[PDB]
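lol so apparently i was supposed to do this last week
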Amino acid sequence: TLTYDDIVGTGLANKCPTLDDTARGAYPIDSSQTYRIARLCLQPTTFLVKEEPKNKRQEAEFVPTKLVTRETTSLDQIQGELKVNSDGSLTFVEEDGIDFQPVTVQMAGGERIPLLFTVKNLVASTQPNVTSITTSTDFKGEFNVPSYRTANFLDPKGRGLASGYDSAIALPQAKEEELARANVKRFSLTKGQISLNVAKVDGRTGEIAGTFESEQLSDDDMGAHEPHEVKIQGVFYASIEPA
Amino acid sequence: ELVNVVDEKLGTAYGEKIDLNNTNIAAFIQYRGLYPTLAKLIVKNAPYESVEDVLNIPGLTERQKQILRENLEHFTVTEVETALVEGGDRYNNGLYK
Amino acid sequence: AELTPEVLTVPLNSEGKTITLTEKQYLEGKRLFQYACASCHVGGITKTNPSLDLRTETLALATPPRDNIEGLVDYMKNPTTYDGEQEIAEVHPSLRSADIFPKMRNLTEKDLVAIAGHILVEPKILGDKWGGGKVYY
Amino acid sequence: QEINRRVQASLASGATLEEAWSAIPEKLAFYDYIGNNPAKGGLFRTGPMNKGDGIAQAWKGHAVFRNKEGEELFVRRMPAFFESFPVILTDKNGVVKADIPFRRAESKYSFEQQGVTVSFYGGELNGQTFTDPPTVKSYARKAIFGEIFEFDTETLNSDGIFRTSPRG
Amino acid sequence: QGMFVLPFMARLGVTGSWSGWSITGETGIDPGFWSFEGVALAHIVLSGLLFLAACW
Ligand code: CLA
Ligand code: HEM
Ligand SMILES: CC1=C(/C=C/C(C)=C/C=C/C(C)=C/C=C/C=C(C)/C=C/C=C(C)/C=C/C2=C(C)CCCC2(C)C)C(C)(C)CCC1
Ligand SMILES: CC1=C(/C=C/C(C)=C/C=CC(/C)=C/C=C/C=C(C)/C=C/C=C(C)/C=C/C2=C(C)CCCC2(C)C)C(C)(C)CCC1
Ligand SMILES: [Ca+2]
Ligand SMILES: [Ca+2]
Ligand SMILES: [Cl-]
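anyway here it is w/ calcium ion bound
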């Protein structure tokens, strides 16, 4: 068993727990019992950004990016109710945890794409008739994506939403119409989608692990510009418990 | 047409009273008996369709119900403004002294 | 302006009684406040919780009311949250927690009376500055 | 001071507010504007004043601010020292009634809370009233500069930053 | 785009930038050192060494 001093500075703190290859079992679900996820962890391994289509209007693809904010990207210590529904499907309702990380990735050509990688208010459900969580189980769900910056955030000229100037004070007599989009901060709230594909199960401990893919918008800098579409891929871990 | 939603919200009852759905928790210090216990329950159980719905919060004492009734005149409700409630800003809005 | 007896006259209780503090009492109050309180309450604010200050109106709206000598002395013996609901001696300096807050150990009843007096008189002098924080420095 | 004197003299001779303010010459109103103050420029802000605030076209008229109770409110003017200045409205006696808050969370004086409105007398906007808070704020922001003018900012690609005059 | 030396770099196989793009429209390529930037830098350093040799 490892301590903080074993892990500190190694990068392991940003990694989700894994399960060995022998963990291909099944975790029995009792539709009479209540369940919870005690710890959900999401460790992104790849960030893809949808290229802004030239104007050919064909299929714009997701392209690779380089992480520049280091090992600060993982979601963890997430907990929430695991409902057993009438139809035998399971629904995870996220209640709390470290369920967001700001992330900046860099596109070919230098363009930096900040995003609020998140699963805030995640609601994800399995297929019906899940008597046991197996390596065939998956969760599909949606979550909220709030503004990358919150309402107090001030831009470099001191303008903000819940705080700040409401004009370009360095340009006292500039016509205000053309600066409106910059002057008037707006708070974004959009929806994201995530798939959790279970690859490993310890039927005894109640630990599951696998891969995820999520899709969400990036930062729109409080309404100053259009967000990019981001696809996040990685691995996850969850501990399921009687509660 | 671009609008600052917080400034706009100041033109509603939000600007005249404690909005149970939006106002930061420190505002409950303005009146006797609301902070921190009732303040916490109120913020935790938001949003409310009406002011009087604050009375239905589970586990409240009779004394608590009394204080709430005495202070309903100081409360309001408007639509939840994402900008004011995200980031946990209702618990800490970056304002101190 | 001067530190008149009128200025040093503060509510003793919620029932309309006042006490007139002596100049020595006021200076002692300032001294003891600096000693036991100012680490957190410099200028009337609260560094570990700026939401609650020591302004008279605020103390007045606390439960039980704290805008008088008896209330403040009681707070110094048995501190509560602003609504009076939980006792907080365990994380707040008091005679009751003088074991874990050693600077309270030698505070006398007279000392507490002095501190309370400083707390109520200061705003009558400094106005908005008291509990005002950096805005009013 | 001279503008107010003339307006008062007009009102005392039985003019309406509209008539009184419309009688104020545009040139006089134009003198009562900080963009013509020679102490508002910059060493490397080069060229004519028009390159900054624009080519003045017309006086919009005098802006009168009022709260929901109907009390007249007065915008605190920018002193020459300040590159930028807050927007603060007081009553006739200097008591604060309205402002543009920086932090909103404990705002008590927002134009929206105070239902601030603006009515124009004289100039292009004579007889018009605005009540929607964005526009009222916009005019208050211009009111910090004194009398409010319409500018051609396109002709010279004006950048909106005050420049000094040949006096300066 | 009025590019003059870029096509000559491309002609002999320099097609990518250190910043990750390539002139064929690929993304997330590693051109190694000999990107357009690497070629330019190499020429600048060469310029300097030739200057010193000229002095000698
Ligand atoms: C008394 C001298 C004087 C004055 C007061 C003016 C003033 C005016 N002229 Mg004018 N001008 C002048 C001489 C003067 N000019 C001369 C001699 C010429 C011929 C070159 C011109 C040519 C001219 C033109 C072509 C134009 C003007 C315009 C204008 C106006 C714009 C001012 C401006 O933007 O300056 C900007 C001033 C500066 C940026 C300050 C310069 C400071 C220098 C660079 C400092 C140098 C430091 C030094 C190197 C340090 C040495 C250190 C060493 C000892 C160790 C303005 C009303 C313009 C106008 O709007 O016309 C309609 C316009 O278009 N001027
Ligand atoms: C003799 C010493 C002190 C006295 C007399 C004093 C006085 C007071 C009073 C009267 C209040 C009630 C505020 C109100 O109702 O508006 C208060 C609140 C508070 N003070 Fe003190 N103060 C002292 C020292 C300290 C110290 C040393 C700390 C921190 C280390 C501290 C932290 C706090 C906190 C956290 C609160 C509010 C707690 C809550 O309501 O949850 N105080 N103080
Ligand atoms: C503005 C202009 C622009 C730009 C221009 C340019 C950019 C130019 C540059 C170019 C240059 C940049 C030139 C080059 C050069 C060089 C020279 C001509 C010099 C020389 C040599 C020599 C003289 C040296 C000597 C030496 C010494 C040093 C040492 C020892 C040895 C010897 C003696 C050899 C354009 C046109 C686009 C357009 C229009 C305008
Ligand atoms: C092979 C290799 C390469 C090629 C390379 C090149 C091409 C080289 C060149 C080199 C160079 C090109 C060098 C230069 C030189 C010389 C030197 C080493 C320097 C010098 C001199 C000096 C010593 C001077 C001194 C002084 C002066 C400073 C001044 C006056 C006085 C005197 C003169 C004294 C590549 C990349 C392709 C890749 C891989 C392979
Ligand atoms: Ca699977
Ligand atoms: Ca322009
Ligand atoms: Cl306060």
